[PDB]
Amino acid sequence: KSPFSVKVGLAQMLRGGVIMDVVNAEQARIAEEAGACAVMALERVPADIRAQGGVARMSDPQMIKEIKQAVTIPVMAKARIGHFVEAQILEAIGIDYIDESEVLTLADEDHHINKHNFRIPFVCGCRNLGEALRRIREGAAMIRTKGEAGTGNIIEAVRHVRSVNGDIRVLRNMDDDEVFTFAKKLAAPYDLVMQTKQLGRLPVVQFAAGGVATPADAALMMQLGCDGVFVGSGIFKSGDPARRARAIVQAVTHYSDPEMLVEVSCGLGEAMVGINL
Amino acid sequence: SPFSVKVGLAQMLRGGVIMDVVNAEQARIAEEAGACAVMALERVPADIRAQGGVARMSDPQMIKEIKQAVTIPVMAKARIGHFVEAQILEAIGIDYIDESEVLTLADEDHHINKHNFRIPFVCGCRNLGEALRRIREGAAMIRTKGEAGTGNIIEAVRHVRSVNGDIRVLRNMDDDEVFTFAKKLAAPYDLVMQTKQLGRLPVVQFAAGGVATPADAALMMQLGCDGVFVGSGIFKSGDPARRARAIVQAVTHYSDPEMLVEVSCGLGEAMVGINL
Amino acid sequence: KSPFSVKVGLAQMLRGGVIMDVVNAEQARIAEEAGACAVMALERVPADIRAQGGVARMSDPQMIKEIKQAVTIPVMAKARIGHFVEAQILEAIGIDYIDESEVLTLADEDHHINKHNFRIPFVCGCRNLGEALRRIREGAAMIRTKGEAGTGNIIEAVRHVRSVNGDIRVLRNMDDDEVFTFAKKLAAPYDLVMQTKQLGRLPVVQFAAGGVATPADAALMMQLGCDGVFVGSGIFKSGDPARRARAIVQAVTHYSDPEMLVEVSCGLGEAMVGINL
Amino acid sequence: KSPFSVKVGLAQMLRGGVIMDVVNAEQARIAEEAGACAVMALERVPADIRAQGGVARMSDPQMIKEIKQAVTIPVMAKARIGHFVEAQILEAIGIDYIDESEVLTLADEDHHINKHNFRIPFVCGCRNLGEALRRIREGAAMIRTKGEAGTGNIIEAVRHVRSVNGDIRVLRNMDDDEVFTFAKKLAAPYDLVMQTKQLGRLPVVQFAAGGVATPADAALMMQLGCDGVFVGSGIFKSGDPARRARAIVQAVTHYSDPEMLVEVSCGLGEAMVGINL
Amino acid sequence: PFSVKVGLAQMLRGGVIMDVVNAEQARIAEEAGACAVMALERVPADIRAQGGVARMSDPQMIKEIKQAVTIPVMAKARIGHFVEAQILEAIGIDYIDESEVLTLADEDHHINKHNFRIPFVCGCRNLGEALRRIREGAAMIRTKGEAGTGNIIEAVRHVRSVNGDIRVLRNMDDDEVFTFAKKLAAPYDLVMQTKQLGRLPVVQFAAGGVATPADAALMMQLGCDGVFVGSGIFKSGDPARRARAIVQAVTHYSDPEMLVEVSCGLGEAMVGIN
Ligand SMILES: [Cl-]
Ligand SMILES: [Cl-]
Ligand SMILES: [Cl-]
Ligand SMILES: [Cl-]
Ligand SMILES: [Cl-]
Ligand SMILES: [Cl-]
């Protein structure tokens, strides 16, 4: 198996999981104790990046090391889009995944990181199938929806999931002779388009992200065909994070069980208020 | 059919007022004033409008508290397209789901597939095409969208006259022209024809959005509605129990001006609202 | 005589009069004592509706009953445009006229009340001859100018009076064969256009309203050919309402007597400040 | 019976008929022998007016007298729109109807003839219900569709018939309170709009005209609800002009009988070629 | 019943329908193996070139064609001209084509085809249009293609559009079908029927610009049930030969050796217009 396949295989172990944003070791422990499949180490949640502005960069390696030592589940961290040196540093710290993330301040407007130059697997965002496939061709081993970051509004995530999955379904029964033109119109590599056609799904793990605020939101993403979910702001910017954390984890595990969804949602305290754009 | 059963259930609400309530005391006041059902929520449309934020399905705990406090039917709101919010609501054991545009839209392109549920749904509309599209998706009851949270009836009047006006056009239309009419409404032809034959919407049809006074409520009834929703209009007024009873009576006695005078007389401050 | 003629006849008794807005029984008494020909009962004057905003509706029947009991002159009250139930309620209270009024919040954007379904006479606003005739065909028994409400600026009333009267004068000597096209261009019913031509004036009583703030303003409206005037804000939002009320009444009665106009205007105290749009 | 009701009654005798354009007495005789209910005397058919251009006016009274003497059925003739003196002349010749016709050169861009000043009944064209009602208010006793003149293409006639009849149907069940606004939007007299509502059809005889080239076209107009048809150009250029005339007459009389329509259409010779605009 | 009319048209599957202007041509079409003939007084290439108003053909010429052959006879009525259709039905022909090559008679409404006993064919350019025509009572659908040019480009476009949207619909999330029906402006029930069947619920032919055997076989390889040919045939050295070649191309559409043979030495195709 190729080095890319190995990275793809590693991310498959996250299936059925919730990845939680954490700003310190206590939060990392709460996330792990609630049953998160991984933590995403950062110095500012997307809701605070949105509200405060400023330039948002890779976190101090010291804070990332503190998180990595506090838990036994995988640790991810964010690098700015195109900032291949930030990614070099992260990889050298010994974390498990890099998220080349649009919630940080864009560092390169025209090019993403060449992810094939790394041993560590990367996650990238997308809003549509063409974007997902372009990120994979650059070497992303996992894809998430961009959703809308820091608002608690699931609308954009739903749009992106339906866009990606919808185009995958179109591709499945398409006349093979029309696939060349479809690849052109997606601006995506033809070989990856054909692989997606043969598989009937994205050739890497696909998670939802952006605006998941409630257990209902998380389960909705799973019922729409995601492999798992990222939660950022939605937890520690809520009234009771440990309980809310557990509730989201349970919602993802038991996504097709309305009785369970009722139980975990019942009396959950204040959700993040967020912002309607 | 299971659809015809849901549609038959909603018929009991004809002649009624459905009231928004935020707690059990309010649910009791609504029931005692003679509401035909209550709509459980954590924020009235006037406060959603004023405060903003993302508005979602209410905590199932608060909904259970309301459902235990009254013996009339309980409805609750789910965001448009949020089929999992609807699954949760159904699992709580309430009577109706309102797939509601006053909450924050969750799916810009698709509504809930309401036929996948046992519980009946209410949906909003602004015109006949929209009403028929919602019914085809499985709505068992339709309301006007009106304008939410303003106390201004103008939009509800516009929507009621739009829906009823197109129904009246359809009634005497040349049959050969109905195909093109269905196309122009972007509505399913079979439901268009059913509406033509019936001379009205094939489900219960209520007014909603901006009903603030007994006069407003009776106006909606005189324009041909089966009943009215009231949200903000009550508990954001000076005396809600009194105002609640007055709206109920107005709907029951909608063609009786002497009664309308009596229930409107000395009612205290209506919601101030907003001219948008 | 037809029921419409009876209503028209009843409004003719207001000719030469001033109709005053009043918010309580004391004000109604002051208006009556100053010689108003009728009072218009309401919970908010147009200057306060303009300043405060909010939805403005039919007044509480209790306050209207209190006004009706406090005076022996006719009582009018306002209903929102198109709100035929508000009008039903007013008629059932036993007042003398309904004003289907644009100073309240519009209830029906496309249709006015079908005024022929009522026994009580209605007043409606207009800005031009076509609008006046459309209101009359719907069953208005009296017409007023819309003017500009709540500003104390007479400019719009003058515009509307000159527009209506000017088109009436055009109509008077017009070639009969051209009247069909004129009716079309006014979007007014041909029969009412011809009746106006034969009469040489509106077939109902015509009052000025909107922005009448001084005795000079009131007399100007009368010299321009109005049958009487409405005053709202212009009085009780002035420095001394009882004196100002009397002065306006006298100005309307003695509109062509400059010596009298001087006397009633002399030392009148502060007029409403208003707003120049 | 008002003088208008008498004119309207006279035109009702044409119901179920075909009116044919004729340029001389021989053609008038052929039209009558084929069973036309009336003839329309003119010096140029609409297909020649279209092709040649020039100013098209009232026909020479000599040629109209020659036609009127050649037949015992009613004789109509055309006057230019607004040309009330052409209409005076026609009436003084002693013909039976005047067509105030848009196929002649417009004489008054803003005003039609005041048809109430004449004893003779008039026919006017329309494209929609508002136009029809405006012509009737001016005194038209009969209405035809304008269709498209001189092309042999029935599309416009169908459009106009469906427009008029469609709006009549809308009007029939409309909320009475909404009829005022409907009259305004049609720019039509309210009283005539209400009369049409009560009757459920136009208050005068209504014929199709413009582009009727075949028996199928004629019967189509009748099945769409017309009282009869005008034919101009569609007839007289033929192998056997008399045969096409008879076929159209039979089609109108037997409009709901497909077997009869087959028979009269079978082997009819060349129809007018016409023009697709 | 509608299902009877739809069943009848299914017999035309694997066929070529040929435009004919007289009885000799109808005989040649039948002898060459056409599954039906379309009677008309002017081919679409002459309608295009000459202009004028184009209407239903004289019933006499239609009767002459119907007597000359034993295969089904179709004829054209103008869009919305329901009386032309009444007349055609009364002559006793087998199908009516409510046709856009004739001059449009109603800009806003088609014939209400359910009021007739005879099956109708209608044109389309896309799936929404096809479903609307079917709901009005069409028992068979054809591509509009481009009429009277001999250029297959528009037929290819329309076939790919219809079939492409059918394939999209087949594996679409059921919850998304309501919005898809709205966007097609098509009746939801017919959209769902199409989804369940995986094809149009009536027979679907290619038409417009089929000029060669290669064109005909291309339409079959793209998933059509058969083809219409108009202009493409009768102006020829040996009209009978081109007719037979197209029939054979449709029957043997996946056999390149056969396609070579029938195309070899065929004489001048219609010149047409780009
Ligand atoms: Cl940025
Ligand atoms: Cl929203
Ligand atoms: Cl307003
Ligand atoms: Cl002209
Ligand atoms: Cl009138
Ligand atoms: Cl055309």
UniProtKB/Swiss-Prot annotation, chain B:
InterPro entries: Aldolase_TIM (IPR013785), PdxS/SNZ (IPR001852), PdxS/SNZ_N (IPR033755), RibuloseP-bd_barrel (IPR011060). D-glyceraldehyde 3-phosphate binds at residue 161. Keywords: Acetylation, Cell membrane, Cytoplasm, Lyase, Membrane, Pyridoxal phosphate, Schiff base. It catalyses: aldehydo-D-ribose 5-phosphate + D-glyceraldehyde 3-phosphate + L-glutamine = pyridoxal 5'-phosphate + L-glutamate + phosphate + 3 H2O + H(+). Changing residue 34 to S: In rsr4-1; strongly reduced oligomerization and 63% reduction in pyridoxal biosynthesis. It is an enzyme of class 4 (lyase). Pathway: Cofactor biosynthesis; pyridoxal 5'-phosphate biosynthesis. SUPFAM superfamilies: Ribulose-phoshate binding barrel. Its main location: cytoplasm. This is Pyridoxal 5'-phosphate synthase subunit PDX1.3.
